[PDB]
Amino acid sequence: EAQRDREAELENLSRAKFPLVSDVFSPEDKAAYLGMLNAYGNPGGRPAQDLNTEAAASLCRVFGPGLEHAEAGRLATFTIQAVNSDGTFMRSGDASFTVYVDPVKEEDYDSDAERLNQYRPPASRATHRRRKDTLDGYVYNHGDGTYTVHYYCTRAARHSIYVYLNDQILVGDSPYRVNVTPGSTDGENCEAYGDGTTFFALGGDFSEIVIQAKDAHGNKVKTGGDKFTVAASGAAKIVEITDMKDGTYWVKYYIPPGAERHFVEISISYHGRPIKGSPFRPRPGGPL
Amino acid sequence: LIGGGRVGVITKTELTSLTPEWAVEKTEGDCVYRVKYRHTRPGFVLMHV
């Protein structure tokens, strides 16, 4: 059984010939190829103790574009930098800075959350009482004193951003007011109200399917400028589609005199996707 | 070379020809009619489907 290498050496000439880079390439030409690889491969690759100090509270800065504005269902980011109690900056990065975001509307904080932190063992007890809508901004630590926050809070409200150091004490001029509002208009949640969803007018008087634009999550968009493709399939003719520039759109249809028994439907829809209640089927208003 | 959009203007050309080439391509069991049409002129006409 004592072969090993003296049967491995005879097998790498038939069925295992293996052209290597030294076999394929002449020695002068191989220095040219390997020299070219330098630019073409992997371009990215006990004296004593002194003291220890913490961030204070009032001196920490909370500059950031998200602490003044938000963007629909997207990031809202602001940078908090820990500051020593005298004014110099802690370029070490050991300070937890939790952010609790409170949309401003017994009458709904927490219930289940307060029994979780009745003790919250007392060295690091929780101080903020959790609301009906606190949305925990994330506490990404950069290791140099700067901390980026990422929070998310839908409603049309004047939200109050709370910043806590070690989840104990408020930081800066917290609470900060952000004017979180409705955002980008999509399909789906847009709703149509009026008499055009229901009985229309005989004799071609007019009818009206005033629609309210909505964003992705619940809120009512009140910035005009969008377009709603309103189909008039059947014996209906869309007279007007006017932007009211407060979120409502103003769409007519009329049935001609003599064609009221026909099939009439209205198919108001955004880009590709319809709205709530399309393919709307109005019924004859007056008798017969 | 008439004015804006040939709208409201009826010369001999809107009277004698006025023929957009149209065709229908109904399949062998669907309920959908595919109707196509093209016309040589701009203007303002009534289509009677």
Binding site: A231, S233, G234, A235, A259, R261, H262, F263, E265 | V32, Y33, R34, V35, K36, Y37, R38, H39, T40, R41, P42, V49
Partner: peptide, 30 residues
């Protein structure tokens, strides 16, 4: 229950029902 085909309930749907294009094929469905 196919039966007859009523004219009044026949619907016309499409994007080029009211808009046209001179020299290009315009399509709509019935």
């Amino acid at each position: 229950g196919a039966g007859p085909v009523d004219a009044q309930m026949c619907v016309a749907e499409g994007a080029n029902l009211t808009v046209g294009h001179v020299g290009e094929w315009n399509m709509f469905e019935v």
